[PDB]
Design a protein around this ligand. Sequence first.
Ligand SMILES: NC(=O)C1=CN([C@@H]2O[C@H](COP(=O)(O)OP(=O)(O)OC[C@H]3O[C@@H](n4cnc5c(N)ncnc54)[C@H](OP(=O)(O)O)[C@@H]3O)[C@@H](O)[C@H]2O)C=CC1
Length: 158
Amino acid sequence: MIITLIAAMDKNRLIGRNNELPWHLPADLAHFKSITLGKPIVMGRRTFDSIGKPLPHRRNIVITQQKNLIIEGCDIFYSLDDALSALTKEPEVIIIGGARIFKEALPKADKMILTIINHSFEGDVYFPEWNDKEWKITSQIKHERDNPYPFQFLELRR
Ligand SMILES: NC(=O)C1=CN([C@@H]2O[C@H](COP(=O)(O)OP(=O)(O)OC[C@H]3O[C@@H](n4cnc5c(N)ncnc54)[C@H](OP(=O)(O)O)[C@@H]3O)[C@@H](O)[C@H]2O)C=CC1
């Protein structure tokens, strides 16, 4: 199993604000969709609520501690370990957030597909800091703007 973390962040690793995105970057949404199609996607309960409904054509997996919580079109697991344990036969598992899930997944992450925006936004939640010595850059594609801010597609392997 390859554990992959996919997230869009700014220059200071900001990811959210009032349970929403602080930006809208169409290029990232298409990138995200192609990368995640046909794979299991693991998310926190707040991140699901942020989306509002299951992402189509994908096995949506939601992590929560609420034991009686039912979510149509999603598989519920009561810890990240239980989810990963259930997805043992899967060749790849994609962790999509949020901040708490990323922090717990980071030490077990094999791969990271990060969108880094060249801008400084206002927000409250951040992507966890990773040790640059443990990760190597496998792909880096920078884009200028049209997507009103500059961004890059950074792919890291541990
Ligand atoms: N830029 C990007 O790519 C992304 C940005 N975001 C942003 O991040 C924010 C949401 O993230 P965040 O606020 O950190 O919330 P999370 O999405 O991390 O979800 C938190 C909730 O998930 C459950 N949970 C998390 N970890 C565990 C665990 N180890 N065991 C059991 N349950 C767990 C809990 O649910 P419960 O309370 O029900 O027990 C908890 O309250 C939003 O603003 C969103 O816009 C999110 C994803 C991607």
